[PDB]
Amino acid sequence: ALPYFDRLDYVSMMTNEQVFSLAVEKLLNIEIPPRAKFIRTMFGEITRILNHLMSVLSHAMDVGALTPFLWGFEEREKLMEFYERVSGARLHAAYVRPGGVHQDIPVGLLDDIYQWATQFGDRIDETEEMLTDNRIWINRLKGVGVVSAADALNLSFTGVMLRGSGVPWDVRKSSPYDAYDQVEFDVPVGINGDCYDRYLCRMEEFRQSLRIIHQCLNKMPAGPVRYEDYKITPPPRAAMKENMEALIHHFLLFTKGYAVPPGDTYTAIEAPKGEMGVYVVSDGSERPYRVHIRAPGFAHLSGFDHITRGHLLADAVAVIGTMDLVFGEVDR
Amino acid sequence: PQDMPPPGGYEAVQYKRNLPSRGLFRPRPLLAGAAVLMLYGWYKLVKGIREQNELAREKM
Amino acid sequence: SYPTRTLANLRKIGLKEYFRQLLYIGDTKYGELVGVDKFGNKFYENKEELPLRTRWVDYAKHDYDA
Amino acid sequence: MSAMSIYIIFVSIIAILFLAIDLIFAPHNPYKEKLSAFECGFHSFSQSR
Amino acid sequence: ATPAGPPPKNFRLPPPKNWDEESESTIDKVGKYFLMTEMLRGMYVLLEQFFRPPYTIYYPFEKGPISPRFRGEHALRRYPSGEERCIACKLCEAVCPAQAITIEAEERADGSRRTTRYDIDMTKCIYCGFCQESCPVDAIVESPNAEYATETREELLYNKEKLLANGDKWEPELAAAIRADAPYR
Amino acid sequence: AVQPTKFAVTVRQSRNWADAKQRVIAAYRAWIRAAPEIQTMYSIPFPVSHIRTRIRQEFERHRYVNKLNVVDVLLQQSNADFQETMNFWRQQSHVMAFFKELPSNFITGFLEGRN
Amino acid sequence: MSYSQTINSLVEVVLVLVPSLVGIAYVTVGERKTMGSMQRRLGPNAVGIYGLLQAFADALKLLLKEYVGPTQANLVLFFLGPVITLIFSLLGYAVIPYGPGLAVNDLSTGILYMLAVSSLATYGILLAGWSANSKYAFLGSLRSTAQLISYELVLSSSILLVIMLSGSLSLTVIVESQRAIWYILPLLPVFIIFFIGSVAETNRAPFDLAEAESELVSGFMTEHAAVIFVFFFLAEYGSIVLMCILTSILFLGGYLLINAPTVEGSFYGLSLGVKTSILIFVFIWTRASFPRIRFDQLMSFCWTVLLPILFALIVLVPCILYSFNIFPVNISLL
Amino acid sequence: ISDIHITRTGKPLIRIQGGRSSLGEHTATVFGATGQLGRYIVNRLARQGCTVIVPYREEMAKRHLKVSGDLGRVIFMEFDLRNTQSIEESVRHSDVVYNLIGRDYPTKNFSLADVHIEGTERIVEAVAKYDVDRFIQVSTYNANPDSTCEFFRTKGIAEKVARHVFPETTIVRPAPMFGFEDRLLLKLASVTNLFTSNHMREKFWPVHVNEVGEALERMLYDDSTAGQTFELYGPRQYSMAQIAELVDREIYKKRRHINLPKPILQPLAELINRVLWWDTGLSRDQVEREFHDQVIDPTAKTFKDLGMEPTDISKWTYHYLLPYRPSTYYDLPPSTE
Amino acid sequence: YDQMPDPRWVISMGSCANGGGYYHYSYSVVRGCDRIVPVDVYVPGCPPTSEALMYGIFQLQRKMRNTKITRMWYRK
Amino acid sequence: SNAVSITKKYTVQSTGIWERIRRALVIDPNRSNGVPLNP
Numbered sequence A: 001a002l003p004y005f006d007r008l009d010y011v012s013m014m015t016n017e018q019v020f021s022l023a024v025e026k027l028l029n030i031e032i033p034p035r036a037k038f039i040r041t042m043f044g045e046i047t048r049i050l051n052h053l054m055s056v057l058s059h060a061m062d063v064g065a066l067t068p069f070l071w072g073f074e075e076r077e078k079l080m081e082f083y084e085r086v087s088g089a090r091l092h093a094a095y096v097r098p099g100g101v102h103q104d105i106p107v108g109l110l111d112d113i114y115q116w117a118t119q120f121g122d123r124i125d126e127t128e129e130m131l132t133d134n135r136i137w138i139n140r141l142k143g144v145g146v147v148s149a150a151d152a153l154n155l156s157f158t159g160v161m162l163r164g165s166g167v168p169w170d171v172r173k174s175s176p177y178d179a180y181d182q183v184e185f186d187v188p189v190g191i192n193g194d195c196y197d198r199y200l201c202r203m204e205e206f207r208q209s210l211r212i213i214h215q216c217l218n219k220m221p222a223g224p225v226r227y228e229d230y231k232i233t234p235p236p237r238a239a240m241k242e243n244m245e246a247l248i249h250h251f252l253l254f255t256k257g258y259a260v261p262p263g264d265t266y267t268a269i270e271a272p273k274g275e276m277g278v279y280v281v282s283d284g285s286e287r288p289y290r291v292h293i294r295a296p297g298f299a300h301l302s303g304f305d306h307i308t309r310g311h312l313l314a315d316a317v318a319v320i321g322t323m324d325l326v327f328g329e330v331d332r
Numbered sequence B: 001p002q003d004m005p006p007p008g009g010y011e012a013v014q015y016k017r018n019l020p021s022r023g024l025f026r027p028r029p030l031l032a033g034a035a036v037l038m039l040y041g042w043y044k045l046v047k048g049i050r051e052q053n054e055l056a057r058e059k060m
Numbered sequence C: 001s002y003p004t005r006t007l008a009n010l011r012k013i014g015l016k017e018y019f020r021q022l023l024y025i026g027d028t029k030y031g032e033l034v035g036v037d038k039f040g041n042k043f044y045e046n047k048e049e050l051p052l053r054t055r056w057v058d059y060a061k062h063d064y065d066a
Numbered sequence D: 001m002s003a004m005s006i007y008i009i010f011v012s013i014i015a016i017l018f019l020a021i022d023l024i025f026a027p028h029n030p031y032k033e034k035l036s037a038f039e040c041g042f043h044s045f046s047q048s049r
Numbered sequence E: 001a002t003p004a005g006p007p008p009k010n011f012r013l014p015p016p017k018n019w020d021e022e023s024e025s026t027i028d029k030v031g032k033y034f035l036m037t038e039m040l041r042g043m044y045v046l047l048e049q050f051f052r053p054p055y056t057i058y059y060p061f062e063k064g065p066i067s068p069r070f071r072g073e074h075a076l077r078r079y080p081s082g083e084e085r086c087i088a089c090k091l092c093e094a095v096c097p098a099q100a101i102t103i104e105a106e107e108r109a110d111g112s113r114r115t116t117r118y119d120i121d122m123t124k125c126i127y128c129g130f131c132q133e134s135c136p137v138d139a140i141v142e143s144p145n146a147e148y149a150t151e152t153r154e155e156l157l158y159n160k161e162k163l164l165a166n167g168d169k170w171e172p173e174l175a176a177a178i179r180a181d182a183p184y185r
Numbered sequence F: 001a002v003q004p005t006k007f008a009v010t011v012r013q014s015r016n017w018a019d020a021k022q023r024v025i026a027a028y029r030a031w032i033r034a035a036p037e038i039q040t041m042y043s044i045p046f047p048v049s050h051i052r053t054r055i056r057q058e059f060e061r062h063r064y065v066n067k068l069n070v071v072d073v074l075l076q077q078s079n080a081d082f083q084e085t086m087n088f089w090r091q092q093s094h095v096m097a098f099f100k101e102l103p104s105n106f107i108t109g110f111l112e113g114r115n
Numbered sequence G: 001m002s003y004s005q006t007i008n009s010l011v012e013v014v015l016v017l018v019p020s021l022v023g024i025a026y027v028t029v030g031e032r033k034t035m036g037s038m039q040r041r042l043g044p045n046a047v048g049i050y051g052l053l054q055a056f057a058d059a060l061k062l063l064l065k066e067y068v069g070p071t072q073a074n075l076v077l078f079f080l081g082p083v084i085t086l087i088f089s090l091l092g093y094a095v096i097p098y099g100p101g102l103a104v105n106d107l108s109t110g111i112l113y114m115l116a117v118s119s120l121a122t123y124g125i126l127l128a129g130w131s132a133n134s135k136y137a138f139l140g141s142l143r144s145t146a147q148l149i150s151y152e153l154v155l156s157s158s159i160l161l162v163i164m165l166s167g168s169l170s171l172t173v174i175v176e177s178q179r180a181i182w183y184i185l186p187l188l189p190v191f192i193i194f195f196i197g198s199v200a201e202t203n204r205a206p207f208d209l210a211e212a213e214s215e216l217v218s219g220f221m222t223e224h225a226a227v228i229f230v231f232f233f234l235a236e237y238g239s240i241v242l243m244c245i246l247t248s249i250l251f252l253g254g255y256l257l258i259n260a261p262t263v264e265g266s267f268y269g270l271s272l273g274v275k276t277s278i279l280i281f282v283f284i285w286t287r288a289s290f291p292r293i294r295f296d297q298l299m300s301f302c303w304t305v306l307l308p309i310l311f312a313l314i315v316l317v318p319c320i321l322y323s324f325n326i327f328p329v330n331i332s333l334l
Numbered sequence H: 001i002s003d004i005h006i007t008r009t010g011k012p013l014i015r016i017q018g019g020r021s022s023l024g025e026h027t028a029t030v031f032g033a034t035g036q037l038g039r040y041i042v043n044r045l046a047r048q049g050c051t052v053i054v055p056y057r058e059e060m061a062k063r064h065l066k067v068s069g070d071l072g073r074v075i076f077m078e079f080d081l082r083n084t085q086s087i088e089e090s091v092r093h094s095d096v097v098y099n100l101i102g103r104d105y106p107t108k109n110f111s112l113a114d115v116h117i118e119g120t121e122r123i124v125e126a127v128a129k130y131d132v133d134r135f136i137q138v139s140t141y142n143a144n145p146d147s148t149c150e151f152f153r154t155k156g157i158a159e160k161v162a163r164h165v166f167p168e169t170t171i172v173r174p175a176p177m178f179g180f181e182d183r184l185l186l187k188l189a190s191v192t193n194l195f196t197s198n199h200m201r202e203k204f205w206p207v208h209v210n211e212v213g214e215a216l217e218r219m220l221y222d223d224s225t226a227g228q229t230f231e232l233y234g235p236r237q238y239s240m241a242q243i244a245e246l247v248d249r250e251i252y253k254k255r256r257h258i259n260l261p262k263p264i265l266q267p268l269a270e271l272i273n274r275v276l277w278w279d280t281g282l283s284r285d286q287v288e289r290e291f292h293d294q295v296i297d298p299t300a301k302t303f304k305d306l307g308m309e310p311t312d313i314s315k316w317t318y319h320y321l322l323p324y325r326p327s328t329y330y331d332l333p334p335s336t337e
Numbered sequence I: 001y002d003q004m005p006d007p008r009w010v011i012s013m014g015s016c017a018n019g020g021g022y023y024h025y026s027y028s029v030v031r032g033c034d035r036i037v038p039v040d041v042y043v044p045g046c047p048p049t050s051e052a053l054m055y056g057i058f059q060l061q062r063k064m065r066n067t068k069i070t071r072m073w074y075r076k
Numbered sequence J: 001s002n003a004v005s006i007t008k009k010y011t012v013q014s015t016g017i018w019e020r021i022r023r024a025l026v027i028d029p030n031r032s033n034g035v036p037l038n039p
């Protein structure tokens, strides 16, 4: 079922994988190793930058600005190499799995991520250079799609849709998961709850994600990337071809699967589009009894008529892009 | 060995907002230089029309 | 391409090849041969090129296919 | 005859020659769904008149 | 909204500034308004992009970069003797998330456990690599090949004859990818 | 909140059987009143008599229901199917999927294969 | 004269239309290659050497593409509007001086002729959009009408400030008058305003409201296919160049330099084209730099910012002329 | 109709009935299927899980047919009439061969005699050569070897050639056809069809093309239809004037025609057909058919012999002519006058 | 698709549009877009790489380049 | 300003006169062009 989560918010694959991997790990009552937690937080923020490049610059394209979209898609084209180097896919990695990550990062990856990191600040500034002070950008977004703080909570808004309204709320600050409680980052919060503040909060998260990524590169520990229990995670191919208990466990994990102790859970993470959650019900068997995905954009598109009725047709275009919808997660 | 950071760690990157005000786009020099172009242009225009009206007197 | 590069590459390869390259690659590339396929395809490398452009192929067939 | 009068003629013959080519050398296969209004793929109320 | 406990220090915004409290000069404010100043900066930033190298590669003469782990089209592989490596355990058929693999096996004429049918519906596959992950003997692999687009969907229903032919053709990369990627598996 | 759409009806329970009795008549009336309007919306080439015949048969299949809580689910479905049809959210293929334009004996069924 | 009247008229029209229609094809490739450079791309480089046959493949592809006449569309008007827009856009090239009086018509009132021809061609956009009887084309046509209620007064106001200096209304005389100084120096605010209106006049970005692709699908041209679409594209890109020529005529000295007649006449032609090509670049640079404005805001910008400033210049500028004794003689001289 | 079909050669066909994933067990070849009729027979055979070989000439005009059937069901073969091998390669795996190849007007490489006689000759000779069970050749109405209209004569001689070579031929004679993309109702609603020799007063019994594709499907299952001759005509007789009256009532347009004297129009029509590359509707013989009248030849089976009752053209005018109503009258209900 | 003028082509990109892909056994998914529209070239992958799609567009243009239009009429 | 030097940013550099030209005519000479280093 894990590749299904790659295809919900399909610009934020490894983050979708994480919320499903953290729900199963909670029902498995296992503690994934420190190197996996640092890989998942670093690729969690590489994913956040990838989403924001698609989200913010698709939104600017709708308002009429074409050039920032082209610049930012070279950067994301750069970052899908990091995906395609640790997994074998540019988009649907299937990398983050309950128990850690599928394989370990290759021996040249951390240096190339740091090399990209030394120039990504300039990328944020040149897209900052065409929109933040542009008077046509300001008059297309300032005062548009305004939602109050008390209504944003009542509308099930999360993420920038909520933080735009002045509420300090981050799921990685309030319920730390993986290695987030081991890093420093700031939380962008707007004050007017409009498309302009939401744009300023997302352009700040570019800088905060790049700040987190640097700390992960510095604090990357050694050790396994898979929980060291072959009853849960697949054994190394060497061990499976060398030892009997490794072969039996490899055979059972790929035919039956592992059994998840019975129960249910709601697990939520700060996805690039908001609180992404999953409600997983467990039989005690090897197949989930119920998997429900709580998609941030489902909760956001529902409040569309609340914030848009009374604006013009162009202002509706402005509000679709600030609300950052991907319909793989909306429809599921 | 696994893929590790270098001994002392990587050096810091640039992430803080950096949009430094350049004198090419300041509203005082642009207004002033506009006024010089606009005042010189009217100077030549006064010379031109005065000459053309005199050229018109000769043709008539 | 840019004038310093295009004239420098044009000087190296000759006018006849320059027009052949404007017909298939549409670029003006110079590099050293690295080998030949079983199909006749020719491969060149030049590390003094823009990233992901240091390796390229001269396709043997006119109706070239990847 | 004057340049203006021929100028008007040539621009009109160009508007005709381009139009005539498309009216002759292009396939013309009109059917019900090809000839419907565009509404992003769903038919809606016809209320533009 | 805000955290329970003492309210955040200085969370309340300062009182609004009046028109005559904004400490910008009229000459600057009016100059910026009429001279379109911030948008001239944006125009200039495009100019220096105009004089930067482009990012473009000339596909297909140049190809973008792919890793040893890259997942392309499927191939069945052989041992150095030409014997098929596939032994019909059916593990990949079981683990498939899209049920794209159909396998039928028997004892071969010489008593060997070998497949009689081996089909991959390439229009059902999700290209996750789970099937090559599970193989006990490195038989099913995904090639580094992505350029195999076809005229019909029948051309995308691979039988054992097509998949062995793929391994017979692509073995040098399949071996070099496994060599480069095996220690991490 | 967000506005309910044009034919949106709040979901409420039937008070008594008299309530349900009057609602079902209101729903049947509203459907057969709209059959001329369905025909030109969906370019139905059949006449409106056939459309109203089908409305009657849909109501007739729930004729013999003596449970308030089953009727109210049924009054819910018709309200949503009416709202869906009148706002032109569904299209011609959906409306024509609703018009169908089993063997009648054992021996007929036997000879052709089961049916 | 030496040869026939009809032949002289014939070859002069050809020398104007044919090189302009070639020039229109290259502005379309040049814009695609210029934005790409600003976008770290290449632009067309595979349809002809360096991509120099791209516009012709686009043109030829459409003239061989099937036309559709929608059932809900008023069809005679569905074809009449693009034909009006194309003919009346291309007519504006009949008064351009490529040298002193080197125009197909050296009319005494060629500035009013250009206002009449541009206004008539926008009416084709309005008609074609309405005729389609589809929502997005209907919304496209209404924006084009709002847009002309926005920029037409702005251009007519702006040009009247140039006529106060020139005193002529003839395109050659205005250029001849600029041998004293280019009108972009004394009329610098007017040059910015006229350029802004010209971008709005051409429905170019940031004012691409009638054909906006991110708000309407293609606006007025959404039901239009094959040759009808191509008529609207040649009209738009021919309007861009014409407005860049006119801006060069009125503010940048026109053809003024920055066998023997042929060598001299060439320098005028290059000089006009160089200044036009720079302004063509500024259009493409402008589409690449800015977001689209909102149509409510364009109307308010022209009507509460631009026009109030232009009316005050219309008062101020003749007051400077009478004060310095610089009213131009309105006789024929230059 | 059953789960077992037994063919003339005696092979059994154990069928699973419904859907495009099932087993119809029949391998058909449909020559001339990219025309107007050909899709309805191909959709009927394909959507019940039968393998259909579709011999084609132009690649892009065959493409709508593949949607009819599942993967591997509709097989395209590229053929020519004067390429006997491609004809033989196309019918030799088959238990039924439909011959729907015809053309109203002569072409620079095919006369009406060349496409009807010789084309049928090759197709039937291959049917005989590989011993194909069934051969449903589609002729025209009024087909007669003694006719003087080239269309009605040449399609009348191919009828006799087919029987002389393969006596079990099911000969099918449809009337002028109406339907979607028909050259009957869509021409009367068009604006090019302005010229005319008679006053649109020739009569015929128009038949729905949908009911003719169904009729051809039933002839495959009713084996007793072999060696027979079928005239497939509609329930009423109309003139071109009565049909054109219905079209005007439906599109709300009141079309008009220019009548010409046949000694004048016929020579011109033979020039337009010889000087234009597209189907112009005008040719010397199409003018000659224009002056002829349909006769239902008795001793010929009918729709009733398939147990089918055709519907009248009037019931179908709204469905097929609505794309041609002007916007003002488009939202109106069907005429049903 | 019907509203797209001739000549027209369809590229099916991806396992879902090819044969329904990972959602082939779903109650709401068409098992391949070629149950709906005719398809000229099929690109494999989920997702096909940017270059794989370019390879399928190069197949379609190679099919255009071998498409006989005016010589087709000359055969009929 | 919170800019790090161009000389640490792991991108292809200008050199010689074109370095002098570019530092004369850009908005920030410490901004990188985004083109990675082949070695």
Ligand SMILES: NC(=O)C1=CN([C@@H]2O[C@H](COP(=O)(O)OP(=O)(O)OC[C@H]3O[C@@H](n4cnc5c(N)ncnc54)[C@H](OP(=O)(O)O)[C@@H]3O)[C@@H](O)[C@H]2O)C=CC1
Residues within 6 Å of the ligand: H031, H032, H033, H034, H035, H036, H037, H038, H056, H057, H058, H080, H081, H099, H100, H101, H102, H103, H104, H110, H115, H138, H139, H140, H141, H174, H175, H176, H177, H178, H183, I076
């Ligand atoms: N439709 C009617 O009103 C009536 C029809 N009929 C007969 O019914 C049959 C089917 O009718 P309909 O579908 O409407 O007819 P169409 O003309 O639409 O189709 C005729 C078919 O014959 C093929 N064909 C024609 N000439 C040749 C040739 N020289 N070589 C190869 N193939 C050729 C065409 O292929 P391609 O498209 O590639 O050219 C096409 O598929 C025809 O035989 C027709 O004469 C008889 C009476 C009335």
Ligand SMILES: *P(=O)(O)OCC(C)(C)[C@H](O)C(=O)NCCC(=O)NCCSC(=O)CCCCCCCCCCCCC
Residues within 6 Å of the ligand: F021, F024, F025, F031, F038, F054, F055, F058, F059, F060, F062, F063, F064, F065, F071, F074, F075, F077, F078, F081, F085, F095, F098
């Ligand atoms: P009289 O005392 O005989 O009263 C008759 C009724 C019917 C009220 C019964 O006596 C009665 O009370 N029976 C129980 C209630 C009942 O019949 N059904 C519950 C009503 S809901 C229902 O029947 C829904 C039917 C389907 C939806 C509506 C029909 C239209 C469907 C779509 C039409 C075409 C669209 C394209």
Ligand code: SF4
Residues within 6 Å of the ligand: E085, E086, E087, E088, E089, E090, E091, E092, E093, E103, E134, E135, E136, E137, E139, E140
């Ligand atoms: S898992 Fe590998 S060895 Fe086993 S049956 Fe499948 S392909 Fe053969």
Ligand code: SF4
Residues within 6 Å of the ligand: E092, E095, E096, E097, E098, E099, E100, E101, E120, E124, E125, E126, E127, E128, E129, E130, E131, E132
């Ligand atoms: S990679 Fe393809 S064949 Fe292998 S398990 Fe995944 S979907 Fe099945």
